[model samples]
Target: KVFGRCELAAAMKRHGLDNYRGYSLGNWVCAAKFESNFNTQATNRNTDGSTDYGILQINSRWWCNDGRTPGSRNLCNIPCSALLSSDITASVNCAKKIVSDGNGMNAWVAWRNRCKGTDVQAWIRGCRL
Candidate 1:
């Protein structure tokens, strides 16, 4: 667990997730909070038969393969299990690439629905970034 938002923000900064490629650090924090609440093991099965994995909740339909799911493009080229681990290196890197693809945080529904155009700075409040 993150223990708190401050820690999560620090880890994000260490991963260079903060302000990379014009994406706001506050938006990243807001997305992470809504996506997985900083839990690395978070997973969700979507209605479309795709599974979301990890803190960023990357979808199996495009990002990673869970083996049981057939026809996944595995765009990240990593196993879905890798995204479920506490070591977030792979997850962060994949997320960076995802945002760099011009989708930005729009790739995440949570970001688009909640983090967008909102007062997202609260996500980083009290965090030393």
Candidate 2:
């Protein structure tokens, strides 16, 4: 699906995420199933009741760590929600950021290393285009 875009999409393709085949899709399907359950409109609750919302179930506060609103309006004209709320882009970017300033894949790799023999991490590491 995501072909010839950026390094991000390229990596996704390498991981077979764009092709709808292999362990990539399997992990995506399973993760979404267990987490958001394929609901693109999914949102989660917060203690303040302000609603930390959307797919990948990202907390709005994490996005608003700089004291700005995390809604689509704050990220200029890029349609932040279009990227933020979507599974492939914003989530991946957020995951990357979680691993120390866009080192998401590294965090993922380290997590897998820790997992060792786990079915989930092994499958994640073995994914290919």
TM-scores for the candidates = 0.93, 0.42
Per residue, candidate 2 scores C-alpha lDDT tens digits across 48-71 of 543333333444444423233434
Q: Give the clashing pairs for model 2.
A: 96-104
Measured by lDDT, the strongest candidate is 1
Q: What residue pairs are clashing in model 1?
A: none
Task: Count the clashes in each prediction.
Answer: 0, 1
Worst 10 residues of 2 by lDDT: 71-80
> How far is 61's C-alpha from truth in model 2 (Å)?
1.1
- Model 1, position 111, has a per-residue lDDT of 94
**Local distance difference test scores for all models:** 0.86, 0.40
